[PDB]
C-alpha cells in the first residue's frame, strides 16, 4: 500500500523569493541564475557587430575574396570569448540568407572561395538585417 498526495501554492511567495536569491549568490550559487539573462540579449544583439567586423576583417586582408577555409578559420578564431564554433557558423549563414548581393561564392576547380563587396552601404544592411523577418536567429 502506497499513495502520492499533492497540493498547490500558486501565490507570489515563490515570486518574491527571487529577491532573496540576490543574497544567496555569494552563499550557495547552485543553479542560482536569473539576471544572467542579459548575456542572452547581449549575444543576440551582436548582429551588427558581426556584420561590421566581417567588413573590417575583409578590408584589412587586402582582398575582397578569400578561400572557404581561410574565411572559416578567420571567423571561428573569434570564439575566444564564451561561445561554441556553431554560433559563429550560424551567423555566417544568417547573413548570407538576407545578403545575396553582399556575400557570394565562387567554386573553382582548385578550391571554393567567397566574395564580399566592402563598398556596399552597411547602413542599408543594418536595417535590412534588423528586419528579423526570416532570421529567427539563424
Tab-separated table of N, CA, C and O in Angstrom:
chain	number	residue	atom	x	y	z
A	1	UNK	N	0.837	-1.212	0.000
A	1	UNK	CA	0.000	0.000	0.000
A	1	UNK	C	0.870	1.260	0.000
A	1	UNK	O	1.808	1.351	0.787
A	2	UNK	N	0.586	2.207	-0.896
A	2	UNK	CA	1.288	3.475	-1.043
A	2	UNK	C	0.284	4.492	-1.592
A	2	UNK	O	-0.817	4.107	-1.988
A	3	UNK	N	0.648	5.773	-1.591
A	3	UNK	CA	-0.158	6.881	-2.082
A	3	UNK	C	0.800	7.999	-2.491
A	3	UNK	O	1.951	8.010	-2.052
A	4	UNK	N	0.315	8.964	-3.269
A	4	UNK	CA	1.096	10.095	-3.748
A	4	UNK	C	0.226	11.358	-3.673
A	4	UNK	O	-0.385	11.723	-4.681
A	5	UNK	N	0.080	11.979	-2.489
A	5	UNK	CA	-0.720	13.188	-2.341
A	5	UNK	C	0.003	14.382	-2.979
A	5	UNK	O	1.204	14.324	-3.258
A	6	UNK	N	-0.715	15.483	-3.181
A	6	UNK	CA	-0.191	16.706	-3.765
A	6	UNK	C	-0.998	17.896	-3.232
A	6	UNK	O	-1.977	17.718	-2.504
A	7	UNK	N	-0.547	19.116	-3.530
A	7	UNK	CA	-1.167	20.372	-3.135
A	7	UNK	C	-0.692	21.451	-4.111
A	7	UNK	O	0.119	21.173	-4.996
A	8	UNK	N	-1.186	22.681	-3.957
A	8	UNK	CA	-0.827	23.819	-4.798
A	8	UNK	C	-0.446	24.984	-3.891
A	8	UNK	O	-0.947	25.104	-2.774
A	9	UNK	N	0.424	25.869	-4.379
A	9	UNK	CA	0.915	27.039	-3.665
A	9	UNK	C	1.082	28.186	-4.667
A	9	UNK	O	2.122	28.835	-4.704
A	10	UNK	N	0.082	28.388	-5.529
A	10	UNK	CA	0.074	29.420	-6.550
A	10	UNK	C	-0.166	30.770	-5.901
A	10	UNK	O	-1.305	31.216	-5.813
A	11	UNK	N	0.889	31.385	-5.378
A	11	UNK	CA	0.840	32.685	-4.737
A	11	UNK	C	2.209	33.336	-4.973
A	11	UNK	O	3.201	32.630	-5.166
A	12	UNK	N	2.299	34.661	-4.865
A	12	UNK	CA	3.502	35.471	-5.068
A	12	UNK	C	4.682	35.193	-4.119
A	12	UNK	O	5.620	35.982	-4.060
A	13	UNK	N	4.637	34.122	-3.334
A	13	UNK	CA	5.688	33.732	-2.405
A	13	UNK	C	6.942	33.412	-3.221
A	13	UNK	O	7.951	34.100	-3.100
A	14	UNK	N	6.863	32.400	-4.094
A	14	UNK	CA	7.987	31.976	-4.925
A	14	UNK	C	8.458	33.078	-5.883
A	14	UNK	O	9.559	33.000	-6.426
A	15	UNK	N	7.618	34.084	-6.127
A	15	UNK	CA	7.895	35.225	-6.985
A	15	UNK	C	8.759	36.224	-6.208
A	15	UNK	O	9.787	36.687	-6.705
A	16	UNK	N	8.352	36.564	-4.981
A	16	UNK	CA	9.079	37.490	-4.118
A	16	UNK	C	10.386	36.851	-3.655
A	16	UNK	O	11.393	37.543	-3.541
A	17	UNK	N	10.427	35.530	-3.460
A	17	UNK	CA	11.636	34.832	-3.028
A	17	UNK	C	12.790	34.989	-4.030
A	17	UNK	O	13.948	34.757	-3.675
A	18	UNK	N	12.516	35.407	-5.273
A	18	UNK	CA	13.556	35.624	-6.283
A	18	UNK	C	14.440	36.798	-5.852
A	18	UNK	O	15.562	36.921	-6.333
A	19	UNK	N	13.944	37.687	-4.986
A	19	UNK	CA	14.669	38.831	-4.451
A	19	UNK	C	15.795	38.226	-3.612
A	19	UNK	O	16.959	38.411	-3.940
A	20	UNK	N	15.446	37.420	-2.597
A	20	UNK	CA	16.368	36.753	-1.676
A	20	UNK	C	17.504	36.013	-2.393
A	20	UNK	O	18.595	35.905	-1.831
A	21	UNK	N	17.292	35.517	-3.618
A	21	UNK	CA	18.335	34.821	-4.368
A	21	UNK	C	19.569	35.717	-4.574
A	21	UNK	O	20.688	35.206	-4.607
A	22	UNK	N	19.383	37.042	-4.674
A	22	UNK	CA	20.461	38.011	-4.868
A	22	UNK	C	21.425	38.052	-3.687
A	22	UNK	O	22.528	38.564	-3.833
A	23	UNK	N	21.049	37.532	-2.520
A	23	UNK	CA	21.949	37.486	-1.372
A	23	UNK	C	22.629	36.107	-1.398
A	23	UNK	O	23.849	35.986	-1.248
A	24	UNK	N	21.839	35.066	-1.678
A	24	UNK	CA	22.251	33.668	-1.753
A	24	UNK	C	23.328	33.429	-2.826
A	24	UNK	O	24.047	32.432	-2.740
A	25	UNK	N	23.512	34.338	-3.792
A	25	UNK	CA	24.516	34.232	-4.852
A	25	UNK	C	25.940	34.081	-4.294
A	25	UNK	O	26.790	33.445	-4.915
A	26	UNK	N	26.221	34.657	-3.125
A	26	UNK	CA	27.543	34.575	-2.512
A	26	UNK	C	27.656	33.364	-1.595
A	26	UNK	O	28.751	32.866	-1.355
A	27	UNK	N	26.520	32.916	-1.071
A	27	UNK	CA	26.408	31.794	-0.157
A	27	UNK	C	26.408	30.426	-0.849
A	27	UNK	O	27.345	29.653	-0.678
A	28	UNK	N	25.351	30.111	-1.608
A	28	UNK	CA	25.196	28.817	-2.275
A	28	UNK	C	25.677	28.762	-3.718
A	28	UNK	O	26.497	27.902	-4.031
A	29	UNK	N	25.159	29.633	-4.592
A	29	UNK	CA	25.495	29.675	-6.019
A	29	UNK	C	25.355	28.299	-6.689
A	29	UNK	O	26.290	27.804	-7.319
A	30	UNK	N	24.214	27.630	-6.503
A	30	UNK	CA	23.939	26.320	-7.086
A	30	UNK	C	22.618	26.463	-7.818
A	30	UNK	O	21.570	26.444	-7.174
A	31	UNK	N	22.673	26.613	-9.144
A	31	UNK	CA	21.553	26.792	-10.086
A	31	UNK	C	20.871	28.152	-9.929
A	31	UNK	O	19.800	28.434	-10.457
A	32	UNK	N	21.521	28.992	-9.162
A	32	UNK	CA	21.202	30.354	-8.813
A	32	UNK	C	21.520	31.181	-10.071
A	32	UNK	O	22.687	31.486	-10.339
A	33	UNK	N	20.518	31.464	-10.910
A	33	UNK	CA	20.682	32.231	-12.145
A	33	UNK	C	19.343	32.862	-12.509
A	33	UNK	O	18.330	32.167	-12.460
A	34	UNK	N	19.322	34.158	-12.820
A	34	UNK	CA	18.171	34.972	-13.183
A	34	UNK	C	18.670	36.206	-13.956
A	34	UNK	O	18.421	36.264	-15.166
A	35	UNK	N	19.390	37.165	-13.334
A	35	UNK	CA	19.879	38.361	-14.018
A	35	UNK	C	20.815	38.040	-15.189
A	35	UNK	O	20.923	38.851	-16.110
A	36	UNK	N	21.401	36.838	-15.214
A	36	UNK	CA	22.307	36.319	-16.237
A	36	UNK	C	21.651	36.339	-17.628
A	36	UNK	O	22.346	36.158	-18.629
A	37	UNK	N	20.326	36.526	-17.711
A	37	UNK	CA	19.606	36.596	-18.987
A	37	UNK	C	20.167	37.710	-19.895
A	37	UNK	O	20.086	37.614	-21.126
A	38	UNK	N	20.754	38.755	-19.292
A	38	UNK	CA	21.311	39.873	-20.038
A	38	UNK	C	22.355	39.377	-21.031
A	38	UNK	O	22.530	39.986	-22.075
A	39	UNK	N	23.033	38.260	-20.744
A	39	UNK	CA	24.038	37.710	-21.632
A	39	UNK	C	23.375	37.238	-22.918
A	39	UNK	O	23.935	37.380	-23.997
A	40	UNK	N	22.187	36.641	-22.805
A	40	UNK	CA	21.449	36.136	-23.958
A	40	UNK	C	21.087	37.302	-24.854
A	40	UNK	O	21.265	37.215	-26.071
A	41	UNK	N	20.604	38.388	-24.248
A	41	UNK	CA	20.235	39.572	-25.016
A	41	UNK	C	21.498	40.210	-25.613
A	41	UNK	O	21.529	40.583	-26.786
A	42	UNK	N	22.595	40.246	-24.854
A	42	UNK	CA	23.863	40.802	-25.305
A	42	UNK	C	24.462	39.958	-26.442
A	42	UNK	O	25.214	40.479	-27.267
A	43	UNK	N	24.116	38.671	-26.535
A	43	UNK	CA	24.609	37.781	-27.577
A	43	UNK	C	23.818	37.956	-28.866
A	43	UNK	O	24.429	38.079	-29.934
A	44	UNK	N	22.485	37.973	-28.785
A	44	UNK	CA	21.628	38.109	-29.958
A	44	UNK	C	21.787	39.465	-30.652
A	44	UNK	O	21.676	39.531	-31.877
A	45	UNK	N	22.118	40.532	-29.921
A	45	UNK	CA	22.301	41.884	-30.429
A	45	UNK	C	23.672	42.072	-31.081
A	45	UNK	O	23.972	43.166	-31.537
A	46	UNK	N	24.534	41.044	-31.135
A	46	UNK	CA	25.825	41.181	-31.814
A	46	UNK	C	25.629	41.185	-33.333
A	46	UNK	O	26.618	41.319	-34.039
A	47	UNK	N	24.401	41.032	-33.844
A	47	UNK	CA	24.059	41.054	-35.267
A	47	UNK	C	24.876	42.141	-36.002
A	47	UNK	O	25.671	41.795	-36.884
A	48	UNK	N	24.759	43.435	-35.639
A	48	UNK	CA	25.515	44.499	-36.290
A	48	UNK	C	27.026	44.352	-36.078
A	48	UNK	O	27.790	44.628	-37.001
A	49	UNK	N	27.468	43.925	-34.891
A	49	UNK	CA	28.880	43.741	-34.574
A	49	UNK	C	29.508	42.769	-35.576
A	49	UNK	O	30.536	43.094	-36.162
A	50	UNK	N	28.900	41.595	-35.789
A	50	UNK	CA	29.413	40.597	-36.727
A	50	UNK	C	29.490	41.203	-38.128
A	50	UNK	O	30.528	41.081	-38.775
A	51	UNK	N	28.437	41.886	-38.596
A	51	UNK	CA	28.438	42.498	-39.924
A	51	UNK	C	29.587	43.508	-40.088
A	51	UNK	O	30.325	43.466	-41.077
A	52	UNK	N	29.751	44.434	-39.136
A	52	UNK	CA	30.813	45.436	-39.218
A	52	UNK	C	32.183	44.777	-39.144
A	52	UNK	O	33.039	45.093	-39.971
A	53	UNK	N	32.407	43.885	-38.177
A	53	UNK	CA	33.682	43.200	-38.030
A	53	UNK	C	33.983	42.445	-39.320
A	53	UNK	O	35.089	42.582	-39.820
A	54	UNK	N	33.031	41.729	-39.921
A	54	UNK	CA	33.247	40.995	-41.164
A	54	UNK	C	33.872	41.898	-42.235
A	54	UNK	O	34.916	41.592	-42.819
A	55	UNK	N	33.228	43.036	-42.471
A	55	UNK	CA	33.669	44.049	-43.432
A	55	UNK	C	35.109	44.443	-43.105
A	55	UNK	O	35.939	44.458	-44.011
A	56	UNK	N	35.400	44.759	-41.841
A	56	UNK	CA	36.717	45.172	-41.367
A	56	UNK	C	37.753	44.094	-41.669
A	56	UNK	O	38.804	44.376	-42.240
A	57	UNK	N	37.439	42.852	-41.312
A	57	UNK	CA	38.254	41.662	-41.496
A	57	UNK	C	38.622	41.528	-42.975
A	57	UNK	O	39.790	41.302	-43.283
A	58	UNK	N	37.672	41.685	-43.902
A	58	UNK	CA	37.959	41.594	-45.333
A	58	UNK	C	38.773	42.805	-45.794
A	58	UNK	O	39.705	42.662	-46.585
A	59	UNK	N	38.423	44.005	-45.328
A	59	UNK	CA	39.118	45.235	-45.688
A	59	UNK	C	40.614	45.109	-45.384
A	59	UNK	O	41.434	45.324	-46.280
A	60	UNK	N	40.973	44.764	-44.148
A	60	UNK	CA	42.356	44.662	-43.713
A	60	UNK	C	43.110	43.508	-44.352
A	60	UNK	O	44.338	43.555	-44.440
A	61	UNK	N	42.407	42.511	-44.880
A	61	UNK	CA	43.029	41.369	-45.528
A	61	UNK	C	43.610	41.747	-46.900
A	61	UNK	O	44.266	40.919	-47.531
A	62	UNK	N	43.386	42.979	-47.389
A	62	UNK	CA	43.855	43.483	-48.687
A	62	UNK	C	43.173	42.752	-49.854
A	62	UNK	O	43.532	42.988	-51.013
A	63	UNK	N	42.171	41.896	-49.607
A	63	UNK	CA	41.488	41.150	-50.651
A	63	UNK	C	39.997	41.033	-50.370
A	63	UNK	O	39.621	40.697	-49.253
A	64	UNK	N	39.137	41.308	-51.367
A	64	UNK	CA	37.692	41.217	-51.216
A	64	UNK	C	37.194	39.773	-51.392
A	64	UNK	O	35.985	39.546	-51.391
A	65	UNK	N	38.096	38.808	-51.608
A	65	UNK	CA	37.765	37.412	-51.806
A	65	UNK	C	38.739	36.549	-51.015
A	65	UNK	O	39.941	36.831	-51.045
A	66	UNK	N	38.229	35.523	-50.327
A	66	UNK	CA	39.003	34.599	-49.500
A	66	UNK	C	38.548	33.162	-49.712
A	66	UNK	O	37.374	32.928	-49.990
A	67	UNK	N	39.457	32.206	-49.528
A	67	UNK	CA	39.206	30.774	-49.656
A	67	UNK	C	38.221	30.334	-48.567
A	67	UNK	O	38.182	30.954	-47.500
A	68	UNK	N	37.458	29.263	-48.813
A	68	UNK	CA	36.460	28.712	-47.898
A	68	UNK	C	37.058	28.485	-46.519
A	68	UNK	O	36.520	28.961	-45.518
A	69	UNK	N	38.205	27.813	-46.473
A	69	UNK	CA	38.848	27.541	-45.198
A	69	UNK	C	39.429	28.810	-44.589
A	69	UNK	O	39.338	28.978	-43.379
A	70	UNK	N	40.000	29.705	-45.400
A	70	UNK	CA	40.592	30.934	-44.881
A	70	UNK	C	39.546	31.774	-44.145
A	70	UNK	O	39.803	32.158	-43.002
A	71	UNK	N	38.390	32.061	-44.759
A	71	UNK	CA	37.343	32.857	-44.112
A	71	UNK	C	36.752	32.115	-42.903
A	71	UNK	O	36.374	32.745	-41.917
A	72	UNK	N	36.683	30.786	-42.977
A	72	UNK	CA	36.159	29.928	-41.924
A	72	UNK	C	37.060	30.077	-40.703
A	72	UNK	O	36.591	30.464	-39.635
A	73	UNK	N	38.356	29.804	-40.880
A	73	UNK	CA	39.391	29.897	-39.864
A	73	UNK	C	39.364	31.301	-39.245
A	73	UNK	O	39.389	31.467	-38.026
A	74	UNK	N	39.263	32.321	-40.102
A	74	UNK	CA	39.201	33.725	-39.717
A	74	UNK	C	37.998	34.017	-38.830
A	74	UNK	O	38.094	34.902	-37.977
A	75	UNK	N	36.866	33.349	-39.053
A	75	UNK	CA	35.678	33.582	-38.261
A	75	UNK	C	35.701	32.763	-36.980
A	75	UNK	O	35.495	33.347	-35.918
A	76	UNK	N	35.943	31.450	-37.054
A	76	UNK	CA	35.962	30.575	-35.888
A	76	UNK	C	36.931	31.079	-34.829
A	76	UNK	O	36.577	31.033	-33.658
A	77	UNK	N	38.082	31.644	-35.208
A	77	UNK	CA	39.071	32.154	-34.252
A	77	UNK	C	38.501	33.185	-33.271
A	77	UNK	O	39.035	33.404	-32.181
A	78	UNK	N	37.417	33.855	-33.657
A	78	UNK	CA	36.731	34.852	-32.858
A	78	UNK	C	36.056	34.193	-31.642
A	78	UNK	O	35.602	34.902	-30.745
A	79	UNK	N	36.001	32.857	-31.561
A	79	UNK	CA	35.373	32.113	-30.488
A	79	UNK	C	36.071	32.228	-29.148
A	79	UNK	O	35.529	31.691	-28.178
A	80	UNK	N	37.237	32.874	-29.066
A	80	UNK	CA	37.972	33.026	-27.814
A	80	UNK	C	37.285	34.021	-26.847
A	80	UNK	O	37.896	34.977	-26.369
A	81	UNK	N	35.997	33.827	-26.573
A	81	UNK	CA	35.155	34.614	-25.697
A	81	UNK	C	34.406	33.607	-24.807
A	81	UNK	O	35.016	33.092	-23.861
A	82	UNK	N	33.151	33.246	-25.098
A	82	UNK	CA	32.360	32.311	-24.294
A	82	UNK	C	31.245	31.641	-25.120
A	82	UNK	O	30.098	31.584	-24.666
A	83	UNK	N	31.539	31.233	-26.360
A	83	UNK	CA	30.607	30.572	-27.283
A	83	UNK	C	31.318	29.453	-28.052
A	83	UNK	O	32.551	29.387	-28.068
A	84	UNK	N	30.541	28.578	-28.682
A	84	UNK	CA	30.984	27.435	-29.469
A	84	UNK	C	31.211	27.833	-30.942
A	84	UNK	O	30.774	28.915	-31.358
A	85	UNK	N	31.844	26.980	-31.775
A	85	UNK	CA	32.077	27.309	-33.182
A	85	UNK	C	30.773	27.334	-33.993
A	85	UNK	O	30.707	27.996	-35.033
A	86	UNK	N	29.732	26.644	-33.513
A	86	UNK	CA	28.437	26.567	-34.163
A	86	UNK	C	27.772	27.931	-34.252
A	86	UNK	O	27.249	28.276	-35.305
A	87	UNK	N	27.807	28.733	-33.184
A	87	UNK	CA	27.189	30.063	-33.172
A	87	UNK	C	27.821	30.972	-34.239
A	87	UNK	O	27.154	31.834	-34.829
A	88	UNK	N	29.114	30.772	-34.496
A	88	UNK	CA	29.859	31.520	-35.491
A	88	UNK	C	29.270	31.186	-36.861
A	88	UNK	O	28.834	32.080	-37.584
A	89	UNK	N	29.212	29.892	-37.186
A	89	UNK	CA	28.699	29.356	-38.443
A	89	UNK	C	27.251	29.770	-38.662
A	89	UNK	O	26.886	30.162	-39.766
A	90	UNK	N	26.431	29.716	-37.607
A	90	UNK	CA	25.035	30.123	-37.635
A	90	UNK	C	24.978	31.570	-38.143
A	90	UNK	O	24.147	31.935	-38.966
A	91	UNK	N	25.905	32.417	-37.680
A	91	UNK	CA	25.895	33.810	-38.097
A	91	UNK	C	26.288	33.981	-39.556
A	91	UNK	O	25.796	34.885	-40.230
A	92	UNK	N	27.194	33.131	-40.037
A	92	UNK	CA	27.652	33.177	-41.411
A	92	UNK	C	26.480	32.946	-42.353
A	92	UNK	O	26.275	33.756	-43.269
A	93	UNK	N	25.725	31.872	-42.114
A	93	UNK	CA	24.579	31.521	-42.928
A	93	UNK	C	23.475	32.569	-42.781
A	93	UNK	O	22.945	32.989	-43.807
A	94	UNK	N	23.170	33.066	-41.569
A	94	UNK	CA	22.109	34.064	-41.394
A	94	UNK	C	22.334	35.286	-42.277
A	94	UNK	O	21.393	35.746	-42.920
A	95	UNK	N	23.565	35.803	-42.300
A	95	UNK	CA	23.963	36.969	-43.067
A	95	UNK	C	23.693	36.702	-44.528
A	95	UNK	O	22.962	37.456	-45.165
A	96	UNK	N	24.300	35.639	-45.053
A	96	UNK	CA	24.158	35.263	-46.443
A	96	UNK	C	22.698	35.047	-46.842
A	96	UNK	O	22.332	35.352	-47.979
A	97	UNK	N	21.847	34.594	-45.916
A	97	UNK	CA	20.439	34.332	-46.199
A	97	UNK	C	19.656	35.597	-46.563
A	97	UNK	O	18.630	35.499	-47.237
A	98	UNK	N	20.109	36.782	-46.143
A	98	UNK	CA	19.450	38.061	-46.467
A	98	UNK	C	20.377	38.995	-47.244
A	98	UNK	O	19.951	40.044	-47.729
A	99	UNK	N	21.635	38.604	-47.419
A	99	UNK	CA	22.653	39.381	-48.117
A	99	UNK	C	23.213	38.651	-49.352
A	99	UNK	O	24.435	38.492	-49.458
A	100	UNK	N	22.371	38.249	-50.329
A	100	UNK	CA	22.824	37.558	-51.532
A	100	UNK	C	23.564	38.478	-52.510
A	100	UNK	O	24.163	37.985	-53.465
A	101	UNK	N	23.508	39.798	-52.313
A	101	UNK	CA	24.170	40.794	-53.159
A	101	UNK	C	25.428	41.340	-52.483
A	101	UNK	O	26.148	42.155	-53.053
A	102	UNK	N	25.681	40.959	-51.227
A	102	UNK	CA	26.851	41.405	-50.496
A	102	UNK	C	27.856	40.266	-50.508
A	102	UNK	O	29.006	40.478	-50.895
A	103	UNK	N	27.429	39.087	-50.039
A	103	UNK	CA	28.235	37.883	-49.983
A	103	UNK	C	27.983	37.068	-51.249
A	103	UNK	O	26.869	37.072	-51.787
A	104	UNK	N	29.006	36.360	-51.704
A	104	UNK	CA	28.940	35.490	-52.861
A	104	UNK	C	29.897	34.322	-52.659
A	104	UNK	O	30.726	34.343	-51.745
A	105	UNK	N	29.762	33.307	-53.510
A	105	UNK	CA	30.534	32.079	-53.554
A	105	UNK	C	30.970	31.858	-54.990
A	105	UNK	O	30.180	32.032	-55.920
A	106	UNK	N	32.213	31.438	-55.175
A	106	UNK	CA	32.840	31.173	-56.449
A	106	UNK	C	33.582	29.853	-56.266
A	106	UNK	O	34.616	29.770	-55.599
A	107	UNK	N	32.987	28.784	-56.780
A	107	UNK	CA	33.525	27.434	-56.744
A	107	UNK	C	34.498	27.353	-57.915
A	107	UNK	O	34.108	27.676	-59.046
A	108	UNK	N	35.745	26.966	-57.667
A	108	UNK	CA	36.801	26.846	-58.665
A	108	UNK	C	37.321	25.415	-58.576
A	108	UNK	O	37.306	24.804	-57.511
A	109	UNK	N	37.870	24.886	-59.670
A	109	UNK	CA	38.411	23.527	-59.697
A	109	UNK	C	39.619	23.294	-58.779
A	109	UNK	O	40.160	22.192	-58.782
A	110	UNK	N	40.096	24.325	-58.089
A	110	UNK	CA	41.218	24.250	-57.172
A	110	UNK	C	40.734	24.349	-55.722
A	110	UNK	O	41.427	23.817	-54.859
A	111	UNK	N	39.601	25.017	-55.448
A	111	UNK	CA	39.008	25.218	-54.121
A	111	UNK	C	37.783	26.131	-54.273
A	111	UNK	O	37.489	26.620	-55.367
A	112	UNK	N	37.046	26.349	-53.192
A	112	UNK	CA	35.871	27.203	-53.135
A	112	UNK	C	36.306	28.483	-52.408
A	112	UNK	O	37.139	28.428	-51.499
A	113	UNK	N	35.752	29.634	-52.795
A	113	UNK	CA	36.074	30.932	-52.217
A	113	UNK	C	34.797	31.766	-52.084
A	113	UNK	O	33.818	31.519	-52.796
A	114	UNK	N	34.841	32.825	-51.280
A	114	UNK	CA	33.767	33.779	-51.014
A	114	UNK	C	34.228	35.126	-51.555
A	114	UNK	O	35.427	35.425	-51.549
A	115	UNK	N	33.280	35.957	-51.975
A	115	UNK	CA	33.439	37.299	-52.487
A	115	UNK	C	32.591	38.194	-51.599
A	115	UNK	O	31.495	37.782	-51.210
A	116	UNK	N	33.075	39.390	-51.269
A	116	UNK	CA	32.313	40.324	-50.459
A	116	UNK	C	32.678	41.743	-50.849
A	116	UNK	O	33.857	42.102	-50.882
A	117	UNK	N	31.660	42.558	-51.107
A	117	UNK	CA	31.829	43.941	-51.516
A	117	UNK	C	31.860	44.917	-50.336
A	117	UNK	O	30.834	45.292	-49.767
A	118	UNK	N	33.063	45.361	-49.955
A	118	UNK	CA	33.297	46.299	-48.857
A	118	UNK	C	32.855	47.744	-49.143
A	118	UNK	O	33.080	48.596	-48.277
A	119	UNK	N	32.304	48.052	-50.324
A	119	UNK	CA	31.841	49.400	-50.662
A	119	UNK	C	30.305	49.507	-50.599
A	119	UNK	O	29.749	50.566	-50.905
A	120	UNK	N	29.607	48.418	-50.262
A	120	UNK	CA	28.150	48.374	-50.144
A	120	UNK	C	27.777	49.156	-48.875
A	120	UNK	O	28.461	49.027	-47.857
A	121	UNK	N	26.698	49.941	-48.914
A	121	UNK	CA	26.210	50.756	-47.798
A	121	UNK	C	25.803	49.844	-46.642
A	121	UNK	O	24.698	49.290	-46.646
A	122	UNK	N	26.689	49.678	-45.653
A	122	UNK	CA	26.450	48.836	-44.481
A	122	UNK	C	25.199	49.324	-43.759
A	122	UNK	O	24.423	48.501	-43.305
A	123	UNK	N	24.934	50.633	-43.704
A	123	UNK	CA	23.746	51.168	-43.039
A	123	UNK	C	22.462	50.513	-43.559
A	123	UNK	O	21.579	50.162	-42.770
A	124	UNK	N	22.358	50.349	-44.883
A	124	UNK	CA	21.200	49.728	-45.504
A	124	UNK	C	21.113	48.275	-45.047
A	124	UNK	O	20.016	47.757	-44.810
A	125	UNK	N	22.274	47.623	-44.915
A	125	UNK	CA	22.388	46.246	-44.474
A	125	UNK	C	21.955	46.162	-43.016
A	125	UNK	O	21.168	45.281	-42.702
A	126	UNK	N	22.392	47.058	-42.126
A	126	UNK	CA	21.988	47.053	-40.722
A	126	UNK	C	20.464	47.062	-40.610
A	126	UNK	O	19.918	46.308	-39.807
A	127	UNK	N	19.776	47.866	-41.428
A	127	UNK	CA	18.319	47.954	-41.386
A	127	UNK	C	17.689	46.664	-41.913
A	127	UNK	O	16.911	45.984	-41.227
A	128	UNK	N	18.048	46.299	-43.146
A	128	UNK	CA	17.516	45.096	-43.770
A	128	UNK	C	17.902	43.827	-43.014
A	128	UNK	O	17.367	42.786	-43.346
A	129	UNK	N	18.817	43.886	-42.043
A	129	UNK	CA	19.250	42.777	-41.204
A	129	UNK	C	18.415	42.839	-39.926
A	129	UNK	O	17.876	41.829	-39.483
A	130	UNK	N	18.240	44.045	-39.363
A	130	UNK	CA	17.433	44.283	-38.171
A	130	UNK	C	15.955	43.989	-38.467
A	130	UNK	O	15.154	43.896	-37.540
A	131	UNK	N	15.566	43.804	-39.734
A	131	UNK	CA	14.188	43.477	-40.091
A	131	UNK	C	13.673	42.188	-39.411
A	131	UNK	O	12.464	42.055	-39.214
A	132	UNK	N	14.571	41.254	-39.062
A	132	UNK	CA	14.326	39.957	-38.414
A	132	UNK	C	13.152	39.150	-39.015
A	132	UNK	O	12.565	38.316	-38.325
A	133	UNK	N	12.794	39.381	-40.279
A	133	UNK	CA	11.695	38.730	-40.985
A	133	UNK	C	11.784	37.202	-40.931
A	133	UNK	O	10.897	36.564	-40.359
A	134	UNK	N	12.808	36.618	-41.545
A	134	UNK	CA	13.053	35.182	-41.642
A	134	UNK	C	14.313	34.683	-40.915
A	134	UNK	O	14.654	33.504	-41.018
A	135	UNK	N	15.013	35.576	-40.207
A	135	UNK	CA	16.246	35.291	-39.489
A	135	UNK	C	16.127	34.212	-38.419
A	135	UNK	O	16.924	33.302	-38.405
A	136	UNK	N	15.194	34.340	-37.490
A	136	UNK	CA	14.825	33.504	-36.333
A	136	UNK	C	16.036	32.998	-35.542
A	136	UNK	O	16.012	32.010	-34.800
A	137	UNK	N	17.073	33.807	-35.664
A	137	UNK	CA	18.381	33.722	-35.109
A	137	UNK	C	19.233	32.614	-35.725
A	137	UNK	O	19.927	31.904	-34.983
A	138	UNK	N	19.158	32.494	-37.055
A	138	UNK	CA	19.848	31.548	-37.919
A	138	UNK	C	21.324	31.474	-37.610
A	138	UNK	O	21.815	30.353	-37.832
